[PDB]
Amino acid sequence: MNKQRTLLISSRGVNYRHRHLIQDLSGLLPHSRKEPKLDTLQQLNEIAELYNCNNVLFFEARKHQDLYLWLSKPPNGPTIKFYIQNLHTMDELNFTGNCLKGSRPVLSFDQRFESSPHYQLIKELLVHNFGVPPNARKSKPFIDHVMSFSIVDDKIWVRTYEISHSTDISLVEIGPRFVMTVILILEGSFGGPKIYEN
Amino acid sequence: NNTKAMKHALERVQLPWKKHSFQEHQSVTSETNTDEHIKDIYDDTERELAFYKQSLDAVLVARDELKRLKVPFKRPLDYFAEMVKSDEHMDKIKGKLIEEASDKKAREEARRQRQLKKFGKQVQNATLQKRQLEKRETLEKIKSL
Amino acid sequence: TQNTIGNIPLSAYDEMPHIGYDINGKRIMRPAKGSALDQLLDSIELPEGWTGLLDKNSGSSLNLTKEELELISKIQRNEQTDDSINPYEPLIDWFTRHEEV
């Protein structure tokens, strides 16, 4: 039933840490397409159309310190800008991860997601944007890793954990972890009136 | 910030998850928990435990729901695929763990070999004295008859 | 894909009678249960489609079809690839039709 695709685009200036973050995100998401670069903003919707892609993720960066992320439905959907400050790359040896590439993810949303219409909107966006379709081309059958999302102090925290068993289950933190704020929401894809502003 | 705009956006974006099996959704909303019970988020320790509990609740919910369905949950370990972390990364992490274990062993040896060297003469003297005392006790017991 | 396995070496699954698990998680039983005579014949006189590397969906060599080999040969010696197109189309002078004033 559910079918979705994601487009990955990074502007010039993405440092090696952010590049590794994008690369491991593209590995966790099997329905993802990568593009070389972007220069200037509405052109992004055309790129998704060229691949019949239903979603697009743009990693903006004014300077090479602060990562920014845009999540939107290219055709006519709204877009949300995230001012990510904390960032941990997949290349950290503190986390041991044997997660299968592109396996089905399990989401975890707290009650704050339902506390406001825009919280529900971002929750749905994450659900369908990060939720791999069951019949995705590059997906995998078994479930081995889960995704955790918790929002406190007006910002959403992202965590990922691998599952484990014994001879009744246990999990260990894996993948990148960061904090994302809500900056601006637009009615249309990279355009339209500014509905919400912090 | 009128709620009408995002409400209309949801009207078009929201899918009929309730009308389809949970497998299509593959998302667990950990509602009933406001996440306000986290003790001193700034401590950097209780926040991790709170996130762990919130993720474990969703893990249990997903395990129950997928056990309701026929989709396998446990990985048989007989299926080999491209792990997210390459074998090189796993080898490097194992090497780091082995280095930590070697450091612990080195500390243990550093806290034992010096004492053994210091007490070596004392240990030898004590052993010799104990052996001589045992010999004398045996000889006296034999002569006691 | 049909196999769900990535770019991992095929050394694994040699002892098992299957090659990974396809979508939805069911065993892909190995169908390449050939005979020694067939293997020897395909070893001396290699099939025209022989390519060495094995297929992700089975242990049999991922032999290429003759049509693919024809296209490969055409590309490899500067032949035409997109057939049915005339390489000598007349120059339709679209701009010369108009005249300046």
Coordinates of C-alpha atoms in Angstrom, one line a residue:
Chain A
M1 CA 0.0 0.0 0.0
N2 CA 2.4 2.7 1.2
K3 CA 4.9 3.8 -1.4
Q4 CA 7.4 6.6 -1.0
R5 CA 10.8 7.8 -2.3
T6 CA 13.3 10.3 -0.9
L7 CA 15.7 12.6 -2.7
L8 CA 19.0 13.6 -1.1
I9 CA 20.6 16.9 -2.1
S10 CA 23.6 18.7 -0.5
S11 CA 24.8 22.2 -1.2
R12 CA 28.4 23.3 -1.4
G13 CA 30.2 23.5 1.9
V14 CA 29.0 20.2 3.4
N15 CA 32.0 19.2 5.7
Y16 CA 33.2 15.6 6.0
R17 CA 31.1 15.1 9.2
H18 CA 27.9 16.3 7.5
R19 CA 28.8 14.3 4.3
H20 CA 29.2 11.1 6.4
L21 CA 25.9 11.9 8.1
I22 CA 24.2 12.2 4.7
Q23 CA 25.9 9.0 3.4
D24 CA 24.8 6.9 6.4
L25 CA 21.3 8.4 6.1
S26 CA 21.2 7.3 2.5
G27 CA 22.3 3.8 3.7
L28 CA 19.6 3.6 6.4
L29 CA 17.0 4.7 3.8
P30 CA 17.0 2.4 0.8
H31 CA 14.5 4.5 -1.1
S32 CA 16.9 7.4 -1.4
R33 CA 18.4 9.1 -4.4
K34 CA 21.6 11.2 -4.2
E35 CA 22.5 14.2 -6.3
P36 CA 25.9 16.0 -6.8
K37 CA 25.2 19.6 -5.7
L38 CA 22.9 22.5 -5.7
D39 CA 23.3 26.2 -6.5
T40 CA 21.1 29.3 -6.4
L41 CA 15.6 27.3 -4.9
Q42 CA 12.4 26.1 -6.5
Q43 CA 14.5 23.9 -8.9
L44 CA 14.6 21.2 -6.2
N45 CA 11.0 20.2 -7.1
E46 CA 12.0 19.5 -10.7
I47 CA 14.8 17.2 -9.6
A48 CA 12.3 15.0 -7.7
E49 CA 10.0 15.0 -10.7
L50 CA 12.8 13.7 -12.9
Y51 CA 13.0 10.6 -10.7
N52 CA 9.3 10.5 -9.9
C53 CA 10.4 11.0 -6.2
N54 CA 7.7 11.8 -3.6
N55 CA 10.1 13.4 -1.1
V56 CA 13.2 15.5 -1.0
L57 CA 15.8 16.3 1.7
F58 CA 18.0 19.3 1.4
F59 CA 20.9 19.9 3.7
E60 CA 21.4 23.7 3.6
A61 CA 24.4 25.3 5.3
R62 CA 25.1 29.1 5.5
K63 CA 28.5 28.5 7.1
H64 CA 30.4 25.3 7.6
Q65 CA 29.5 25.0 11.3
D66 CA 25.7 24.8 11.5
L67 CA 23.9 22.2 9.5
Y68 CA 20.4 22.9 8.2
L69 CA 17.8 20.5 6.8
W70 CA 14.7 20.9 4.7
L71 CA 11.9 18.2 4.6
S72 CA 9.1 18.6 2.1
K73 CA 7.0 16.9 -0.5
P74 CA 8.4 18.2 -3.8
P75 CA 5.1 18.4 -5.8
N76 CA 3.1 20.9 -3.7
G77 CA 3.7 20.0 -0.1
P78 CA 4.9 22.2 2.8
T79 CA 8.5 22.4 3.9
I80 CA 10.1 22.7 7.3
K81 CA 13.5 24.0 8.1
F82 CA 15.5 22.5 11.0
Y83 CA 18.5 24.2 12.7
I84 CA 20.5 21.1 13.7
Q85 CA 23.2 22.0 16.1
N86 CA 24.4 18.7 17.7
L87 CA 25.7 16.1 15.3
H88 CA 27.2 12.6 15.8
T89 CA 28.4 10.8 12.7
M90 CA 28.1 7.2 11.8
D91 CA 31.9 6.8 12.0
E92 CA 32.0 6.9 15.8
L93 CA 33.5 3.8 17.4
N94 CA 31.4 4.2 20.6
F95 CA 28.3 2.6 19.0
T96 CA 28.4 -1.0 17.7
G97 CA 25.9 -1.5 14.9
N98 CA 25.2 -4.5 12.7
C99 CA 22.0 -3.1 11.4
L100 CA 20.9 -4.4 8.0
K101 CA 21.2 -1.7 5.3
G102 CA 17.7 -0.5 4.4
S103 CA 15.8 -2.8 6.7
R104 CA 12.4 -1.8 8.0
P105 CA 12.6 0.9 10.6
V106 CA 10.5 1.2 13.8
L107 CA 9.4 4.7 14.9
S108 CA 8.9 6.0 18.4
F109 CA 6.9 9.2 18.9
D110 CA 6.0 10.7 22.3
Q111 CA 2.7 12.4 23.2
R112 CA 4.1 15.9 22.3
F113 CA 3.8 15.0 18.6
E114 CA 0.0 15.1 19.0
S115 CA -0.1 18.2 21.1
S116 CA -0.4 20.6 18.2
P117 CA -1.4 20.5 14.5
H118 CA 2.2 21.3 13.3
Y119 CA 3.6 18.7 15.7
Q120 CA 1.3 16.2 14.1
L121 CA 2.3 17.4 10.6
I122 CA 6.0 16.9 11.3
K123 CA 5.2 13.5 12.9
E124 CA 3.4 12.4 9.7
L125 CA 6.2 13.8 7.6
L126 CA 8.8 11.8 9.5
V127 CA 6.5 8.7 9.4
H128 CA 6.2 8.6 5.6
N129 CA 9.5 10.2 4.8
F130 CA 11.6 7.9 7.0
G131 CA 9.3 4.9 6.9
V132 CA 10.6 2.6 4.1
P133 CA 7.7 1.1 2.0
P134 CA 7.2 -2.6 2.7
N135 CA 7.8 -3.4 -0.9
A136 CA 10.7 -1.0 -1.6
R137 CA 13.2 -2.0 -4.2
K138 CA 16.2 -2.0 -2.0
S139 CA 14.5 -2.8 1.3
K140 CA 15.2 -5.9 3.4
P141 CA 12.6 -8.2 5.0
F142 CA 13.9 -8.7 8.6
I143 CA 13.7 -6.0 11.3
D144 CA 17.0 -5.3 13.1
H145 CA 17.1 -1.6 14.0
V146 CA 14.6 1.0 15.3
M147 CA 14.3 4.8 15.3
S148 CA 13.5 6.8 18.4
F149 CA 12.2 10.4 18.3
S150 CA 11.6 12.5 21.4
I151 CA 10.8 16.2 21.7
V152 CA 11.6 18.2 24.8
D153 CA 12.4 21.9 25.2
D154 CA 10.6 22.6 21.8
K155 CA 13.2 20.6 19.9
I156 CA 13.0 17.1 18.6
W157 CA 15.8 14.6 19.5
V158 CA 16.8 11.8 17.0
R159 CA 18.2 8.5 18.2
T160 CA 18.6 5.1 16.6
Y161 CA 19.1 1.7 18.4
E162 CA 19.9 -1.8 17.2
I163 CA 18.0 -4.8 18.6
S164 CA 19.5 -7.9 20.1
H165 CA 18.4 -11.2 21.6
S166 CA 19.7 -13.7 24.1
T167 CA 19.4 -17.4 25.0
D168 CA 13.9 -11.5 26.1
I169 CA 15.4 -8.7 23.9
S170 CA 17.9 -5.9 24.3
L171 CA 19.0 -2.9 22.3
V172 CA 22.2 -0.9 21.9
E173 CA 22.5 2.6 20.5
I174 CA 23.6 2.8 16.9
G175 CA 23.7 5.3 14.0
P176 CA 23.8 9.1 14.2
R177 CA 22.2 11.1 16.9
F178 CA 21.4 14.9 16.8
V179 CA 18.9 17.5 17.9
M180 CA 16.6 19.4 15.5
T181 CA 14.6 22.5 16.1
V182 CA 11.6 24.0 14.3
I183 CA 12.5 27.3 12.6
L184 CA 10.1 28.0 9.7
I185 CA 7.2 26.2 8.0
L186 CA 6.0 27.1 4.5
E187 CA 2.7 26.3 2.9
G188 CA 4.2 25.2 -0.4
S189 CA 7.4 23.4 -1.4
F190 CA 10.1 26.0 -1.0
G191 CA 7.6 28.8 -1.4
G192 CA 4.3 30.2 -0.4
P193 CA 3.3 32.1 2.7
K194 CA 5.2 31.5 6.0
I195 CA 2.6 29.7 8.1
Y196 CA 4.7 29.2 11.3
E197 CA 7.7 31.0 12.6
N198 CA 9.4 30.5 16.0
Chain B
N1 CA 0.2 31.1 12.9
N2 CA -3.2 29.9 11.9
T3 CA -3.8 26.2 12.4
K4 CA -6.0 26.1 9.3
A5 CA -3.0 26.0 6.9
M6 CA -1.3 23.0 8.5
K7 CA -4.7 21.3 9.0
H8 CA -5.3 21.6 5.2
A9 CA -1.8 20.4 4.5
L10 CA -2.4 17.3 6.7
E11 CA -5.8 16.7 4.9
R12 CA -3.8 16.1 1.8
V13 CA -0.7 14.5 3.3
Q14 CA -2.3 12.3 5.9
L15 CA -2.8 8.7 4.7
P16 CA -5.5 6.2 5.9
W17 CA -3.2 4.3 8.2
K18 CA -6.1 3.2 10.4
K19 CA -7.7 1.5 7.4
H20 CA -4.6 -0.5 6.6
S21 CA -2.5 -3.1 8.5
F22 CA 0.1 -1.8 10.9
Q23 CA 2.8 -3.4 8.6
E24 CA 2.3 -0.6 6.1
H25 CA 2.5 2.0 8.8
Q26 CA 5.6 0.5 10.5
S27 CA 5.5 3.4 12.9
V28 CA 4.6 3.2 16.6
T29 CA 3.5 6.4 18.4
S30 CA 4.6 6.2 22.0
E31 CA 1.6 8.2 23.3
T32 CA 0.5 8.3 26.9
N33 CA 4.0 9.4 27.8
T34 CA 4.6 13.2 27.8
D35 CA 8.4 12.7 28.3
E36 CA 8.2 15.3 31.2
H37 CA 9.4 12.7 33.8
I38 CA 13.1 13.0 32.6
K39 CA 15.2 14.0 35.6
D40 CA 17.6 16.9 34.8
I41 CA 17.9 16.4 31.1
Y42 CA 21.1 18.5 31.3
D43 CA 22.7 15.8 33.4
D44 CA 23.4 13.9 30.1
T45 CA 22.6 10.6 31.8
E46 CA 18.9 10.6 32.6
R47 CA 18.0 11.8 29.1
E48 CA 19.7 8.7 27.6
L49 CA 17.7 6.4 30.0
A50 CA 14.5 8.2 29.2
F51 CA 15.1 7.8 25.5
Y52 CA 16.0 4.2 26.0
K53 CA 12.7 3.6 27.8
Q54 CA 10.7 5.4 25.2
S55 CA 12.3 3.3 22.5
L56 CA 11.8 0.1 24.4
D57 CA 8.1 0.8 24.8
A58 CA 7.8 1.2 21.0
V59 CA 10.0 -1.9 20.5
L60 CA 7.6 -4.0 22.6
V61 CA 4.6 -2.5 20.8
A62 CA 6.1 -3.4 17.5
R63 CA 7.0 -6.9 18.6
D64 CA 3.5 -7.5 19.7
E65 CA 2.0 -6.1 16.5
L66 CA 4.3 -7.9 14.2
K67 CA 3.7 -11.1 16.2
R68 CA 0.0 -10.5 15.4
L69 CA 1.1 -10.4 11.8
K70 CA 3.1 -13.2 10.0
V71 CA 6.1 -11.0 9.2
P72 CA 9.2 -12.5 10.9
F73 CA 10.7 -10.4 13.7
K74 CA 13.8 -12.1 14.9
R75 CA 16.8 -12.2 12.6
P76 CA 17.8 -15.9 12.1
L77 CA 21.4 -14.9 11.7
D78 CA 21.6 -17.3 8.8
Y79 CA 20.8 -14.4 6.4
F80 CA 24.0 -12.5 5.4
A81 CA 23.5 -9.0 3.9
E82 CA 25.3 -5.7 3.6
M83 CA 25.5 -4.5 7.2
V84 CA 25.2 -0.7 7.7
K85 CA 28.7 -0.7 9.3
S86 CA 31.2 -2.4 7.0
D87 CA 33.3 -5.3 8.3
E88 CA 36.2 -2.9 8.5
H89 CA 34.3 -0.6 11.0
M90 CA 33.4 -3.7 13.1
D91 CA 37.0 -4.8 13.1
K92 CA 38.1 -1.4 14.2
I93 CA 35.6 -1.3 17.0
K94 CA 36.7 -4.7 18.1
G95 CA 40.3 -3.5 18.1
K96 CA 39.3 -0.5 20.2
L97 CA 37.6 -2.8 22.7
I98 CA 40.6 -5.1 22.8
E99 CA 42.9 -2.1 23.4
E100 CA 40.7 -1.1 26.3
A101 CA 40.9 -4.7 27.7
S102 CA 44.7 -4.6 27.2
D103 CA 44.9 -1.3 29.1
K104 CA 42.9 -2.9 32.0
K105 CA 45.2 -5.9 32.0
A106 CA 48.2 -3.6 32.0
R107 CA 46.9 -1.7 35.0
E108 CA 46.2 -5.0 36.8
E109 CA 49.7 -6.2 36.1
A110 CA 51.2 -2.9 37.2
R111 CA 49.3 -3.1 40.4
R112 CA 50.5 -6.7 41.1
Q113 CA 54.1 -7.2 39.7
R114 CA 55.6 -4.4 41.8
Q115 CA 54.1 -5.9 45.0
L116 CA 55.3 -9.4 44.0
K117 CA 58.8 -8.1 43.4
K118 CA 58.8 -6.2 46.7
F119 CA 57.5 -9.2 48.7
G120 CA 59.5 -11.8 46.8
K121 CA 62.2 -12.1 49.5
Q122 CA 59.5 -12.0 52.2
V123 CA 57.4 -14.7 50.4
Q124 CA 60.5 -16.9 50.1
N125 CA 61.3 -16.5 53.8
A126 CA 57.7 -17.2 54.8
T127 CA 57.6 -20.3 52.7
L128 CA 60.9 -21.6 54.1
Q129 CA 59.7 -20.9 57.6
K130 CA 56.4 -22.7 57.0
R131 CA 58.1 -25.7 55.5
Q132 CA 60.6 -25.9 58.4
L133 CA 57.8 -25.6 60.9
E134 CA 55.9 -28.4 59.2
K135 CA 59.0 -30.6 59.2
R136 CA 59.6 -30.0 62.9
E137 CA 55.9 -30.7 63.8
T138 CA 56.0 -34.0 61.9
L139 CA 59.3 -35.0 63.5
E140 CA 58.0 -34.1 67.0
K141 CA 54.7 -36.0 66.4
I142 CA 56.7 -39.1 65.3
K143 CA 58.9 -38.7 68.4
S144 CA 55.9 -38.1 70.6
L145 CA 55.2 -41.8 70.6
Chain C
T1 CA 16.9 -7.0 -6.8
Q2 CA 14.8 -9.9 -5.7
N3 CA 17.5 -11.0 -3.2
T4 CA 17.8 -8.1 -0.6
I5 CA 21.5 -8.8 -0.3
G6 CA 24.0 -6.0 -1.0
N7 CA 27.6 -6.0 -2.4
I8 CA 28.8 -8.7 -0.1
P9 CA 31.1 -11.5 -1.2
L10 CA 29.4 -14.7 -2.4
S11 CA 31.7 -16.9 -0.3
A12 CA 28.9 -17.2 2.2
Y13 CA 25.9 -19.6 1.6
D14 CA 28.2 -22.1 -0.2
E15 CA 27.5 -24.8 2.4
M16 CA 23.8 -23.8 2.8
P17 CA 21.3 -24.9 0.1
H18 CA 20.0 -21.3 -0.3
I19 CA 21.3 -17.8 -1.2
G20 CA 19.9 -15.3 1.2
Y21 CA 16.3 -14.3 1.7
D22 CA 14.3 -12.4 -0.8
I23 CA 11.7 -9.7 -0.1
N24 CA 9.2 -10.6 2.7
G25 CA 11.7 -13.1 4.2
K26 CA 11.5 -16.5 2.6
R27 CA 14.3 -18.9 1.7
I28 CA 15.7 -18.8 -1.9
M29 CA 16.6 -22.4 -2.5
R30 CA 19.6 -22.9 -4.7
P31 CA 18.5 -24.1 -8.2
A32 CA 22.1 -24.5 -9.6
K33 CA 22.3 -28.2 -8.8
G34 CA 24.1 -29.1 -12.0
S35 CA 26.1 -32.2 -12.9
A36 CA 29.8 -32.7 -13.1
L37 CA 29.7 -33.4 -16.8
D38 CA 27.8 -30.1 -17.5
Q39 CA 30.3 -28.1 -15.3
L40 CA 33.3 -29.6 -17.1
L41 CA 31.7 -28.9 -20.6
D42 CA 31.0 -25.3 -19.6
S43 CA 34.6 -25.1 -18.3
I44 CA 36.6 -26.0 -21.4
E45 CA 34.2 -24.6 -24.0
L46 CA 33.0 -21.5 -22.0
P47 CA 29.5 -20.4 -23.0
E48 CA 29.3 -17.4 -25.3
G49 CA 27.5 -15.6 -22.5
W50 CA 30.1 -16.5 -19.9
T51 CA 31.1 -13.6 -17.7
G52 CA 32.9 -15.2 -14.7
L53 CA 31.0 -13.4 -11.9
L54 CA 28.1 -15.2 -10.3
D55 CA 24.5 -14.0 -9.9
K56 CA 23.1 -12.8 -6.7
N57 CA 19.9 -14.9 -7.3
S58 CA 21.7 -18.2 -7.7
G59 CA 25.2 -19.8 -7.8
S60 CA 25.1 -20.2 -11.6
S61 CA 27.3 -17.8 -13.5
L62 CA 25.5 -14.6 -14.6
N63 CA 25.8 -15.4 -18.2
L64 CA 24.9 -12.5 -20.5
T65 CA 22.5 -13.0 -23.4
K66 CA 23.7 -12.8 -27.0
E67 CA 21.8 -9.5 -27.5
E68 CA 23.8 -7.9 -24.7
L69 CA 27.0 -9.2 -26.1
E70 CA 26.1 -7.7 -29.5
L71 CA 25.5 -4.3 -28.0
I72 CA 28.8 -4.6 -26.0
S73 CA 30.7 -5.4 -29.2
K74 CA 29.0 -2.5 -31.0
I75 CA 30.1 -0.1 -28.3
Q76 CA 33.6 -1.5 -28.1
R77 CA 34.5 -0.8 -31.8
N78 CA 32.6 2.4 -32.4
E79 CA 29.5 0.9 -34.0
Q80 CA 25.9 2.3 -33.9
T81 CA 24.1 1.7 -30.6
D82 CA 20.7 3.4 -31.0
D83 CA 19.6 1.6 -34.1
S84 CA 16.7 2.6 -36.4
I85 CA 18.0 6.2 -36.5
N86 CA 19.4 7.4 -39.8
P87 CA 23.0 8.6 -39.3
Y88 CA 22.7 10.7 -42.5
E89 CA 19.5 12.8 -41.9
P90 CA 19.2 15.7 -44.3
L91 CA 19.9 19.1 -42.8
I92 CA 16.4 20.5 -42.3
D93 CA 17.3 24.3 -42.5
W94 CA 14.6 25.6 -40.1
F95 CA 16.2 29.0 -39.8
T96 CA 16.8 29.6 -43.5
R97 CA 13.0 29.4 -44.1
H98 CA 12.6 32.9 -42.7
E99 CA 14.0 36.1 -44.3
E100 CA 15.3 39.2 -42.6
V101 CA 13.8 42.6 -43.5

